[PDB]
Amino acid sequence: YRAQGVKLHDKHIEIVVRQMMKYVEVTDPGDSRLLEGQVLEKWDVEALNERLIAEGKTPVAWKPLLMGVTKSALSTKSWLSAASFQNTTHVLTEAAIAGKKDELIGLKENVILGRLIPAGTGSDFVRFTQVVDQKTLKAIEEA
Amino acid sequence: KEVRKVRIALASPEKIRSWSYGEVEKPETINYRTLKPERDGLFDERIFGPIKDYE
Amino acid sequence: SDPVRQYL
Amino acid sequence: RVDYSGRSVIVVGPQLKLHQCGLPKRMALELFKPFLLKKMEEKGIAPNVKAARRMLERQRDIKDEVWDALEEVIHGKVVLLNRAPTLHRLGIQAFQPVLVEGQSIQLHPLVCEAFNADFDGDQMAVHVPLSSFAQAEARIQMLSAHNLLSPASGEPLAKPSRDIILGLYY
Amino acid sequence: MEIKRFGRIREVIPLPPLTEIQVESYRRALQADVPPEKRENVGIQAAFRETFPIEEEGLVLDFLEYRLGEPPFPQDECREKDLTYQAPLYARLQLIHKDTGLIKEDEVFLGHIPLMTEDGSFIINGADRVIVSQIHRSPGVYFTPDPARPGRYIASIIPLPKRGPWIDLEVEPNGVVSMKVNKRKFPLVLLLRVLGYDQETLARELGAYGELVQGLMDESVFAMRPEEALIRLFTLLRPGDPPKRDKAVAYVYGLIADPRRYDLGEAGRYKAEEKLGIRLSGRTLARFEDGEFKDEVFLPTLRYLFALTAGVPGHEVDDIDHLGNRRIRTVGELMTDQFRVGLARLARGVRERMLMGSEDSLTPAKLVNSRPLEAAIREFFSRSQLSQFKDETNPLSSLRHKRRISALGPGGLTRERAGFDVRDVHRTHYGRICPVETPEGANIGLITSLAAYARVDELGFIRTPYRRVVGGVVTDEVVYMTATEEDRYTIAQANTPLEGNRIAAERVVARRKGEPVIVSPEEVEFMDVSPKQVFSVNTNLIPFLEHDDANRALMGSNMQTQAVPLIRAQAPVVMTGLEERVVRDSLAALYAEEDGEVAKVDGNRIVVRYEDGRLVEYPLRRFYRSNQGTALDQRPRVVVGQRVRKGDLLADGPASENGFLALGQNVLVAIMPFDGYNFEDAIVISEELLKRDFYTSIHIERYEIEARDTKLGPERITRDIPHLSEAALRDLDEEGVVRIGAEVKPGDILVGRTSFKGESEPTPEERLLRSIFGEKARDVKDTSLRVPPGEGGIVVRTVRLRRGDPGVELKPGVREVVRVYVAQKRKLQVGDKLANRHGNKGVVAKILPVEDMPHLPDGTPVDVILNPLGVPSRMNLGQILETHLGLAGYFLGQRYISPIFDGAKEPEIKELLAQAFEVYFGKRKGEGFGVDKREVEVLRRAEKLGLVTPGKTPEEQLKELFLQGKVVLYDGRTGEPIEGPIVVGQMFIMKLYHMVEDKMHARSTGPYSLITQQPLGGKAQFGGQRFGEMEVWALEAYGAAHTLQEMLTLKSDDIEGRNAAYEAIIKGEDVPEPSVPESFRVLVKELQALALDVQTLDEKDNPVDIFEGLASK
Amino acid sequence: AEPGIDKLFGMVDSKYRLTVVVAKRAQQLLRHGFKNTVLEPEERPKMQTLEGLFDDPNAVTWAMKELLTGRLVFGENLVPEDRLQKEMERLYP
Amino acid sequence: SHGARKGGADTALRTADSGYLTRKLVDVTHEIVVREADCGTTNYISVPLFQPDEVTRSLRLRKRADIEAGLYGRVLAREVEVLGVRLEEGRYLSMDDVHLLIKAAEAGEIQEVPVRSPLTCQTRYGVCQKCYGYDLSMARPVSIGEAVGIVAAQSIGEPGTQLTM
Amino acid sequence: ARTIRIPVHMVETINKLSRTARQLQQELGREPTYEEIAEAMGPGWDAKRVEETLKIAQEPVSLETPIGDEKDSFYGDFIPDEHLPSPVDAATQSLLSEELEKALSKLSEREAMVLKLRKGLIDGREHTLEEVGAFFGVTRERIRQIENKALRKLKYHESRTRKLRDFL
DNA sequence: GCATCCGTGAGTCGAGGGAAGCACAATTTAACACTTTTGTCAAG
DNA sequence: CTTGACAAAAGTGTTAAATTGTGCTATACTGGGAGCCGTCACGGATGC
Ligand SMILES: [Mg+2]
Ligand SMILES: [Zn+2]
């Protein structure tokens, strides 16, 4: 981009690279039911590892993994977004067998169902804000 | 209530039969002359419901 | 792979 | 595909403000029809909504008071101008419609670069947010005069352009 | 308005007939005028002699001759009645009984062959159509290098498309050459054994190269007899099938030796002989004679491959994109192939019919079923990609379309599977394919235009003309020659100086195999006819092409096709010389057959009394609607008693002025920024153009309605429409159709129709309503035809076709059809697209009053203002030079012809500007006026910018500006001059077919889709705007969650939401919270149909019913 | 730009909270027919009509103008939703 | 005309590649949203100010446009003391701060700047406000609830048509 | 072989009609009209019956047939759904009910119920005079007098206000 | 290691495009009349 | 207001034509046919 004169902040590229490095590969199952060589999200194994330490068990040993944007997108936890992207037959056949439950976390899943996307005015941070004047509030405070 | 999760799973023959309102036994779609759906066909009104509301 | 050939 | 949506050729409006667009009267009448029928019913133009809709059916049956009511209908409201391909988020922007005579959308010169829009035959789509939430989002977040910097780089995106630079440089 | 011609190149030959590619090929295919005995084995005649005779193996059906009858209806009748302009085809066949020895002969009707009109188009189902010529790889034998392994080559034998499998000859790494057929690889030894080849023959022929021959000398099958080798090969080709000789020889003979199934083609046979140096008896890989196979081309192909691998000097690889290896399938060849395909199906039915059913009492009429033949021909002219709706916006549009060459179509490349190699400009495109004219975008390079002087030969190879040069003098002998033949000579350039017939330049610019070289005159063997042969007809219409970048010259030539005819269209001030020929060769205009005197002139017909004594009446096509809606009319240009010579103009066609191609107006153009209304290609025009009806065009729209038979009852086209006042039915006549000459606006009824209402009990509210008002509900409803929004005009024609009318084949159940023609005279308005020939295009953004436009010191305002910023980035300097020349012509009252690459130059333009200044300024001196104070101030600034020489008088400095094309321009608003001189001149601008009137569209509610319940799409359907994925991403990036949700549910497919939203708005309320879209409901049901249990759950994993209990048992 | 948009953005921690407050206030004004406005008669937005100046019918314009005054209290968990509606019904029938 | 056709063919076949790339980038990052003010992570990235030039075998200062694209609108993870100016931890780097850092680097006072980036963010299903930095459209700290993943994908994918030239 | 099944006897007729048309087509050197086909079929056949038979023999066209060289347009994209009420049609029905309810408000507390029962505004189905009488406990003539009285005052109220003529 | 199989390739628009016959039984449907509800006119 | 008269429309019942479904035909007949390369290129995933 620089060689072409395009100016782009490094944040946008680092957001995508963060998604590429989102997964890890298990090398030692430890005191868990995970399989050696199984690929899962880095957040899950770290959360599982800190959990295993809590009850005094051998933590899961993992290895950082890098995959492309297509592979990272297709191996997402939500089957609705993955099915709408590509390999619809392959995504749906695995999700149906695994009985995968889509929690509707991202934007594509909510768009498919026509729901309010969890971003912007639809985010839980601002969605529940209330507005009231100093007279409709003062009267309520009395009660 | 409100939809929070969507789940996909294999459908058993018992579930497929529970979904169905009737077995489609004939390939006939509609009558060629009267243009009404044929009984037990792919467009059967006893299976999939009335063509027009409350009739 | 050919159903007609397989039948024949 | 969406309701309350139109499309027409774009021409340059140099007299417009950064937050304004030139919406043809005929497009606005169809885009804001349910709002216009309510306004026509409120005034003496039509007895009810159904009689109001019959009036707009025939071009020669439309009186001159309908256009005055249409001006009242769109007051404060904004519309969304969209040019394909919408490569970035500035491909859709909110403008306050200004009723004009003609059939071409008048585009402000400063938003051309964000839209990647010139006037050699380009077209854009017009969309009408309906609710107070949809209007508030467009008037606060999507307004053209509020998005002056590029989200990609942080540099100004609505900035002086070909003829504007030439005049100031001279 | 005298015409001044520039240039030095003397063209020895004129332009060939511009439609000969379409017209000559179809004549050679039908052969309808040559007597049957003198017909040659080409076209549909060759198709008859290929499939016939038909033998049962003892009934023989032989073919004797064919003939084409007169068309049942004329061309005008076919267009009016939605018919096909076609000629009946009759075949004279004889049935031969081998047993008895008796012959029965009769003429059988084989169907109708569509006829090509004089202009080179077809009338299919009443619509003019053009068959686009297809370019593809020429059949033959080609030797391409293997990319994976260096030093090795692959021999490919390509037959005609769908006329045999491709054959690959490759030297395997093991050393054994393997022949790949039908995706199957097998050693070439086996098939070579089948062709009666022994070890001695192979070593004697192929043994002079090295170890390659020893790799083809496997004796495990050499001792094996040829008959067993055929059985062994047959099992390899189709494993599993029962291997029998009668089933093996038939397959092998059909594969490479059957002319009816394998056809190398005349082009393929010629290319094979030219390459391999052999003489093919036929067009098959092998000949099957005397009960044994004989080799034709495998050994010559194998010898060449081995020698090429060895490294002999005389053998080389073949460039597949070389235009000597690419041929053109014209309309005649494309139809003949479809004729042969259908005729093969006819033979198939004939074979299966002569073996069953009264074999003793059989006749050729009973055996022959013409339905397969008509179906194949009808399919080609209707549903083929190469059969395209005729583009007849103007005469140039139709001419361009017939000369287009497309690499796509059945048997060609794919729009998305085509790489850069097929899309590039090969060096052999010079003089044969235009390098600039092509549709930018996904179709770039895949659709091209034939060059002006290029012509397609019999074999399908494009040829270009060259002037033979002997001993350094250029002769008048012109040789038409293909790319492969062109590569053997040193061909000079047409701009080479000539001292008469001898080349004067000591160093001559020439081409050797496409590479530019410098050679002496004695080394020159051929010369170009003219620069015009390198470019197509459209590009040859762009003056000063040498100053235009190819990227913009592409746009200029393409946009000339999209220019609409104008009621006051004028030929350009600066021309190239092809304007007369384009009109003449398009057949749009009317010319005298020979010398004669005009007898009667009228707006409807011209009667000419030719010297032969015959009175020939010429009807004039008046206000005829083109396929694109543009009105095509011929206006007489002669008077009663005028003497006309042969070829003299009688009536101007559409978009022509006195026989010259008139695609636009010549307007005074000032090149300057103007208050931001010129911003980013936008155009500023004067109101004076509208006052004198410039850029005013007539367009006709056709509306169609049908009265059909319904189970409830027949639809009636009548004036008695229920629940309508007289105001709505004022313009309808007694028959229910709008009267001719009535002005119709949107919502106005064109044809009144009433249809029976479906039997259904009314809603209880309606029943109370009817009972209150005492009105009996009628049995019919309003289904009349009304003017769509944004349309209208004057009704000019009403066509009423009824069932049983002569030649009217209405669809079953259709009582009648009524067609209404509404014509509107469109003036230039804001948003209409304008363009010039040099690629500069833009929409009108502002129409100013005459007093607001900048004006000359003499008071002449300019007509168009163009932004100078569109020049530097686009590098199209031709518009600048046309403006300078047009400025001289404006004051001298003359037009110019500057041929491309040989025409007007700056010294010649400046000397004309010097003459123009003397009449532009010397007039002012005579009138008694000096130099303006405002002019002096501009001249003071001009000398500061270096535009004029300091120290000269104001008159002398004004001349210097004029010689640069710049004048002192005053401002109509302020009265003060523009601070710098402005390039002002006369330029030819076209009004393109894309108008804002036909593109503006809006919608609140309307039709919705069947399954998804989403709004339809398209202005014609009153559809909504597609809010695709990228638009959804933009709302997500903005954070407009509620705006996005509305466009997903409330405005698209939330049936309960969209009904409530509309009801809330008309009641003055806020729209409600939306619900689940219907598209997701469809997704759930479609997923269930795949046996996938999709369930929507809540916070506690309990299922949530989104179907409202309508699907739960 | 919208009047006082810079001041509006500086009054909330997230620009999307500003839109929620404006849209929710606009609906409150529409529901009660602009009778719950905190704007004095000199401050009510006005539109120029052929007959004369009238109250601006755009509630979003009212909500933005009211919020600049500072007489509106906005936030999360201010009052119960049912309690807020019933109280506003009683004051502004 | 040979080059003009190749350029025209390149443009036609690059729009499909650029458009496909943008769709891939959207679908991998569509769920990334600024979901909290701070995730509490102490990790960071040290954005370099000097580039390892190899032709001269020496460290040379990076281009100003390059340093701005990596430091503008970013929260400092650690305190920086350059040219007598104390940039405290948690301070968003404005253009003046970025220019000040480059000025300090030219004086040999700092080699890299430790800033919070989405790479080291610990927020699940998105980023935090302090790891993203500024809303480049508003030149102020990003508001919680913005779909930065969609913005990032569009920002990268929009100039794709211009890349190959 | 047909998506819309046709009986054997009618299929045999279609085949015979096609053979007759084909034989006449080669004899006349053109496509025969329905008159020539009907005559060649024999007794009991006229142009109307031949035309109806051809109309019956029309196979349904696929909703997924592409149009244009680009593979992005289909037949189903151009066929509107005319079954579900449009938003305009749904809105005017609710507007009509609101206006009708206001008109019935001016009626007496007894007349309105009789009129709505007779017009099926409550149960969805009309009730005959005796059933309306069995509902209230009066003979049929009482309802026919009440209905004619309730329906007449509505004419007066509508004529004196003209708030209900537009919906008609 | 390499062969081999599978899925992927911008957006909006636009317009044009739209070869068996018979017998026989079995079922369905138009055609008809008679009686029964419903609706209506009178009366007191 | 209800009684009764009074009749038009609507509702059962028979029933003939019209339509639809099903069986049968006896020299002998015993393994298909359209496709057919500018094979699209390239990355990934599986496999043996
Ligand atoms: Mg453009
Ligand atoms: Zn963080």
The CATH code of the domain that includes A132 is 6.10.250.1410
Q: Is G139 exposed, middle or buried (0-12, 13-18, 19+ CB in 10 A)?
A: middle
**Strand J closer than 7 A to residue H10 Cβ:** yes
Return all residues near E482 (Cβ < 8 A) that are at least 6 apart: E323, E324, E457, E461, E462, E463
E776 CA from I33 C1′ (Å): 30
Are residues D111 and D98 part of one domain? yes
Are E473 and E501 a contacting pair, CB within 8 Å? yes
Asked if strand J comes closer than 7 Å to E162 Cβ, the answer is yes
Nucleotides of I under 7 A from a protein CB: 7-23, 29, 37-42
The CATH number of whichever domain residue A60 belongs to comes to 3.30.60.280
User: Which residues lie closer than 8 Å to G38 by C-beta, 6 or more apart?
Assistant: G128, G129, G130
Taking the C-alpha atoms of residue D33 and residue E1065, their distance in angstroms, rounded to an integer, is 10
For residues F69 and F88, what is the distance between their CA atoms, to the nearest angstrom? 20
> A43: which chain G residues are within 8 Å (Cβ-Cβ)?
124
Q: What is the CA angle E856-E685-D100, rounded to 5?
A: 135
Residue of A90, A100, A105, A116 to mutate, interface with B, max B Cβ within 10 Å: A100
**In 10 A of CB E951, how many CB atoms?**
8
> What one-character DSSP code corresponds to residue E1047?
I
Contact exists between D and B (3 or more beta carbon pairs < 8 Å): no
List the H8 CA – J23 C1' distance (angstroms): 13
Contact G75, G88 (CB under 8 A): no
* E534 and E523, same domain (yes or no): no
- Pairing between β-strand D92-100 and β-strand E59-68 as defined by DSSP bridges: unpaired
Q: Cα–Cα distance between E879 and E863 in angstroms, integer? A: 16
CA distance H95 to chain D (A): 9
Residues E403, E537 contacting (CB under 8 angstroms): yes
Decide which of E271, E299, E318 is a domain's last residue. E318
| Residue E44 contacts residue E83 (beta carbons within 8 Å) | no
- D89 and D133 co-located in one domain: yes
Q: In terms of C-beta density within 10 A (0-12 exposed, 13-18 middle, 19 or more buried), how is residue H12 classed?
A: exposed
Q: How many CB atoms lie within 10 A of CB E804?
A: 11
Q: Look up the CATH number of the domain holding residue D45.
A: 1.10.40.90
Residue A141's domain comprises 128-143
Cβ contact E841:E559 at 8 Å? yes
d(CA E93, CA E567): 55
The contacts found for H102-109 with CB under 8 angstroms, 24 or more apart, are H102/H163, H103/E772, H103/H154, H103/H157, H103/H158, H103/H163, H103/H164, H104/H154, H106/H153, H106/H154, H106/H157, H107/H150, H107/H153, H107/H154, H108/H150
- C1' of J28 to CA of E61 (Å): 26
Q: Which nucleotides of J are covered by protein (CB under 7 A)?
A: 1-4, 19-23, 31-41, 44-45
Q: Which of E216, E188, E186, E212 is nearest to E201 (CA)?
A: E216
The terminus-to-terminus CA distance of chain C in angstroms comes to 13
Class of domain H6-59: mainly alpha
CATH number for the domain harbouring residue D107: 2.40.40.20
Which residues in G lie closer than 8 A to residue F15 (C-beta atoms)? 135, 138, 143
Q: Among E59, E51, E72, E67, which residue's Cα sits nearest to residue E107?
A: E67
Per the CB < 8 A criterion, the answer to whether D51 and H166 are in contact is yes
Pairing type for strands E103-114 and E615-619 reads unpaired
CATH code for the domain of E584 = 3.90.1100.10
D131 token code pair: 């609710």
Cβ separation of E1044 and A114 shorter than 8 Å?
Answer: no
H8-28 vs H34-41: helix axis angle to the nearest 10? 120
DSSP readout, F42-83?
A: TTS-EEE-SS-EEE---HHHHHHHHHHHT-EEEEESSS-HHH
Coil, strand or helix at E402? helix
Q: Give the DSSP H or E segment for E518.
A: strand E515-519
List chains adjacent to chain G, taking adjacency as at least 3 C-beta pairs closer than 8 Å. Answer: A, D, E, F
In this structure, the dihedral spanned by the alpha carbons of residues E915, E916, E920 and E922, taken in order and rounded to 10 degrees, is 0
- Rounded to whole angstroms, the distance from the CA of residue E759 to the C1' of nucleotide J13 is 26
The enclosing domain of G78 has a CATH number of 3.90.105.10
Q: How many helices (H) and strands (E) does chain H have?
A: 7, 0
- Contact between B10 and A97 using a beta-carbon 8 Å cutoff: yes
Task: Say yes or no: Cβ of H145 under 7 A from any atom of strand J.
Answer: yes
The beta-carbon contacts of E764-768 under 8 Å, at least 24 apart in sequence, are E764/H119, E764/H120, E764/H121, E764/H124, E765/H93, E765/H96, E765/H97, E765/H100, E765/H121, E766/H96, E767/H119, E767/H120, E768/H100, E768/H115, E768/H116, E768/H119, E768/H121
The Cα–Cα gap between E383 and E389 comes to: 11
CA-based nearest residue to E528, from E491, E557, E563: E491
- What does this entry list as its resolution, in Å? 2.8
Determine how many CB atoms are found less than 10 A away from the CB of residue E765.
22
The residues, ordered by sequence, that sit 6+ positions from E170 with a Cβ below 8 Å of its Cβ are E146, E152, E154, E155, E177, E178, E180
For strands E864-866 and E664-671, give the pairing: parallel
Decide if G12 contacts E444 (C-beta within 8 A): yes
What long-range pairs does E73-76 form, CB within 8 A, spacing at least 24?
A: E73/E807, E75/E117, E75/E123
What domain range includes position E367? 16-138+319-464+530-588
Give the helix/strand (H/E) hosting E43. helix E43-51
Pairing of strands G33-36, G126-128: parallel
Residue ranges of the domains in chain H?
Answer: 6-59, 85-166
Reported for E957-965, long-range contacts at CB under 8 A and 24+ positions apart, including other chains, are E958/E917, E958/E921, E958/E931, E959/E914, E959/E917, E959/E921, E962/E913, E962/E914, E962/E916, E962/E917, E962/E920, E962/E921, E963/E910, E963/E913, E963/E914, E963/E917, E965/E880, E965/E883, E965/E884, E965/E887, E965/E913
C-alpha pair distances (Å), H91 with each of E524, E770, E1068: 85, 19, 13
Tell me the C-alpha distance between E1036 and G147, whole Å: 7
CA distance to partner chain D, nearest, from residue G26 (Å): 11
Q: Are residues D53 and D133 in the same domain?
A: no
C-alpha to C-alpha distance for E871 and E309, rounded to whole angstroms = 54
Q: Which helix (H) or strand (E) holds E915?
A: helix E906-927
Q: Cα–chain-centroid distance for residue E1046?
A: 42
Cα–Cα dist E270/E264, whole Å = 9
CATH number of residue E514's parent domain? 2.30.150.10
The separation between CA E854 and the C-alpha centre of its own chain, rounded to angstroms, equals 41
Query: Residue G117: what residue type?
Result: S
Cβ neighbour number for residue H156 with a 10 Å cutoff: 10
Cβ of E843 near strand J (under 7 Å)? The reply is no
Beta strands in E658-772 (DSSP E): 660-661, 664-671, 683-686, 697-708, 716-717, 743-744, 749-751, 753-756
Interface of D with H (CB under 8 A): 47-51, 53
CB atoms within 10 A of CB E62: 16
Check residue E641 and give left, alpha or beta (phi > 0: left; psi -120 to 50: alpha): left
Taking the C-alpha atoms of residue E417 and residue E414, their distance in angstroms, rounded to an integer, is: 5
Q: DSSP secondary-structure letter at A68?
A: -
- Angle at alpha carbon of residue E973, lines to E970 and E979, rounded to 5°: 40
Q: Give the domain ranges of chain F.
A: 1-93
For residue F48, give Cα distances in angstroms to D72, D76, E524, F29.
9, 12, 83, 21
Domain shared by E856 and E887, yes or no = yes
Please, where are the H alpha helices in chain G? 2-29, 64-71, 95-106, 129-132, 148-157
Amino acid found at E136: H
Tokens of E941: 């600034």
Alpha carbon E202 to its chain centroid, in Å, reads 51
Residue H141: CB less than 7 A from any atom in strand J: yes
Domain assignment of residue E1045, yes or no: no
Residues in a beta bridge with E1086: none
Nearest-CA neighbor of G110 among G97, G119, G95, G120?
G97
Residue type, E323: L
Q: How far apart are CA E607 and CA E603, in angstroms?
A: 11
- Sign of the torsion formed by the C-alpha atoms of E654, E660, E662 and E667: negative
Chains sharing 3 or more CB pairs under 8 A with chain F: A, D, E, G
Query: Exposed, middle or buried: residue E377 (CB in 10 Å: 0-12, 13-18, 19+)?
Result: buried
CA distances from E106 to A70, E32, E54, E152, H28 (A): 69, 20, 16, 59, 15
The verdict on residue E1023 lying in a domain is no
In sequence order, the β-bridge partners of residue D20 are D96
How far the first Cα of chain E sits from its last, in Å, is 88
Q: Where are the alpha helices (DSSP H) in A2-87?
A: 10-20, 42-54, 69-74, 79-85
CA quadruple E343, E346, E347, E349: dihedral, nearest 10 = 160
Q: What is the CA radius of gyration of chain C?
A: 4
CA of E262: nearest nucleotide by C1' is: J36
Q: Is the CB of A71 under 7 A from strand J?
A: yes
Task: Mutate one of E421, E422, E423, E436 to test the G interface: name it (highest G CB count within 10 A).
Answer: E423
- HSE-CB at E165 with a 13 A cutoff on CA atoms is 16
Helices (H), G30-140: 64-71, 95-106, 129-132
* CATH value at residue E880: 2.40.270.10
E33 and E121 share one domain: yes
Torsional sign, CA E1053, E1056, E1061, E1066: positive
Return d(Cα E7, Cα E903) in angstroms, integer: 4
Establish whether the CB of E429 is closer than 7 Å to any nucleic acid atom in strand J.
no
* Both structure tokens of D81: 């101008």
Beta-bridged to residue A22, according to DSSP, are none
How many whole angstroms separate alpha carbon G123 and alpha carbon G121? 6
Amino acid identity of residue E775, one-letter, is E
Sort G115 into a burial class: Cβ within 10 Å, 0-12 / 13-18 / 19+. buried
Domain that holds residue D69: 24-76
Cβ-count burial of E199 within 10 angstroms (0-12 exposed, 13-18 middle, 19+ buried)? middle
Q: How many residues does chain D have?
A: 170
Whether E869 is covered by a domain: the verdict is yes
Reduced to 3 states (helix: H, G, I; strand: E, B; else coil), residue E871 is helix
Provide the number of structural domains found in chain E: 6
Question: What CATH number was assigned to the domain covering residues H85-166?
Answer: 1.10.10.10
From the number of C-beta atoms within 10 Å of its C-beta (0-12, 13-18, 19+), residue E42 rates as: middle
Dist. CA G3 → ligand 1 center (Å): 23
CA of H142 to C1' of I44 (A): 15
Backbone torsions φ then ψ of E669, nearest 5 degrees? -120, 130
State whether D9 and D85 are in the same domain: yes
Rounded CA separation E791/E797 (Å): 16
Distance of CA A143 to the CA centre of its chain: 44
3-class SS at E96? Answer: strand
Q: Are E596 and E613 in contact (CB under 8 A)?
A: no
* Structure tokens that stand for A105 in this block: 């976390």
Residue D61 counted as an annotated binding residue = no
E1107 and A CB contact within 8 Å = no
Burial class, E1046, CB count within 10 angstroms (exposed 0-12 / middle 13-18 / buried 19+): buried
SS3 D131: coil
Q: What is the CATH number of domain F1-93?
A: 3.90.940.10
Find, among E46, E36, E163, E44, the residue nearest to E114 by Cα.
E44
Residues of chain G with Cβ-Cβ distance to F16 below 8 Å are 143-146
Among the listed residues E404, E328, E699, the one whose alpha carbon sits nearest the alpha carbon of residue E558? E404
CB-based contact, A14 to chain G, within 8 Å: yes
Helix (H) or strand (E) holding E277: none
Neighbouring C-beta atoms of residue D123, cutoff 10 Å: 19
Report whether E916 contacts E888 (CB < 8 A).
Answer: yes
State the angle between helix axes of H8-28 and H47-56 in degrees (0 to 180), rounded to the nearest 10.
Answer: 120
Segment 99-128 of chain G within 8 Å of chain A by CB: 117-119, 121, 124-125, 127
| Token pair of E1046 as six digits | 């509305």
Residue type for position F58: N
- 3 state DSSP class of E696: coil
E866 CB below 7 A from strand J atoms: no
